[PDB]
Design an enzyme around this catalytic site. Structure first.
Site, PDB file in Angstrom:
ATOM      1  N   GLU A 192       0.602  -1.577  -0.091  1.00 31.28           N
ATOM      2  CA  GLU A 192      -0.067  -0.071   0.620  1.00 31.28           C
ATOM      3  C   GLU A 192       0.791   0.992  -0.132  1.00 31.28           C
ATOM      4  O   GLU A 192       0.063   2.297  -0.722  1.00 31.28           O
ATOM      5  CB  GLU A 192      -0.882  -0.273   1.190  1.00 31.28           C
ATOM      6  CG  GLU A 192      -1.921  -1.257   1.689  1.00 31.28           C
ATOM      7  CD  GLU A 192      -2.753  -0.891  -0.041  1.00 31.28           C
ATOM      8  OE1 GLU A 192      -3.137  -0.069  -0.801  1.00 31.28           O
ATOM      9  OE2 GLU A 192      -3.866  -1.886   0.066  1.00 31.28           O
ATOM     10  N   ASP A 207      -6.666   5.940  -5.088  1.00 31.97           N
ATOM     11  CA  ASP A 207      -6.311   5.222  -5.244  1.00 31.97           C
ATOM     12  C   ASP A 207      -6.142   4.592  -6.333  1.00 31.97           C
ATOM     13  O   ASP A 207      -6.410   5.375  -8.197  1.00 31.97           O
ATOM     14  CB  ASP A 207      -6.759   3.819  -4.408  1.00 31.97           C
ATOM     15  CG  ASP A 207      -8.110   3.188  -4.841  1.00 31.97           C
ATOM     16  OD1 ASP A 207      -8.790   4.185  -5.627  1.00 31.97           O
ATOM     17  OD2 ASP A 207      -8.563   2.663  -4.512  1.00 31.97           O
TER      18      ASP A 207
END
Ligand SMILES: [Cl-]
Ligand SMILES: [Cl-]
EC number: 3.2.1.17
Length: 162
Positions: A11, A20
């Site tokens: 991440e 994202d």
């Protein structure tokens, strides 16, 4: 290596709101703020989560505190889910970690829909489940990460992350 280091690699860490890979507003270590297109809505969600007026920026410590909560929520989501729990309980520690990574990224929802892979996993048919998990939108969209997770599942080792 462990679940925390593993996801911090997958991440990354960003202290300002970002989009994202699906274009959703996120911050920290993969903490999704909202699926809506409003940055305002995102900023408000961030403020409600941190408990202060952030203005779209958080500290490292605040990031980590979210991440902690989120890993915790992923685990309990699994234990509470009737199809997943028994799969997760059947496995060793490394592979459990692969499973939490998946739930963390995709939600309890997304992951329970890999029924066929879960069955194979529960039977310990690793190479097969590995082949099955790759036939998925998940692998097609975020292939490098998907491979790392799938290797972990398959081998039961942390090689993909070393
Ligand atoms: Cl939250
Ligand atoms: Cl990727």
């Amino acid at each position: 290596m462990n679940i925390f280091e593993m996801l911090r690699i997958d991440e990354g860490l960003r202290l300002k709101i970002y989009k994202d890979t699906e274009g959703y507003y996120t911050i920290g270590i993969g903490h999704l703020l909202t699926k809506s297109p409003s940055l305002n809505a995102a900023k408000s969600e961030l403020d409600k989560a941190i408990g202060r007026n952030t203005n779209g920026v958080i500290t490292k410590d605040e990031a980590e505190k979210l991440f902690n909560q989120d890993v915790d929520a992923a685990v309990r989501g699994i234990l509470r889910n009737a199809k997943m729990k028994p799969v997760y309980d059947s496995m060793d520690a490394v592979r459990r970690a692969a499973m939490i990574n998946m739930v963390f990224q995709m939600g309890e929802t997304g992951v329970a829909g890999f029924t066929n892979s879960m069955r194979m996993m529960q039977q310990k048919r690793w190479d097969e489940a590995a082949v099955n998990l790759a036939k998925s939108r998940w692998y097609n969209q975020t292939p490098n990460r998907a491979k790392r997770v799938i290797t972990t599942m398959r081998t039961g080792t942390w090689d993909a992350y070393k």
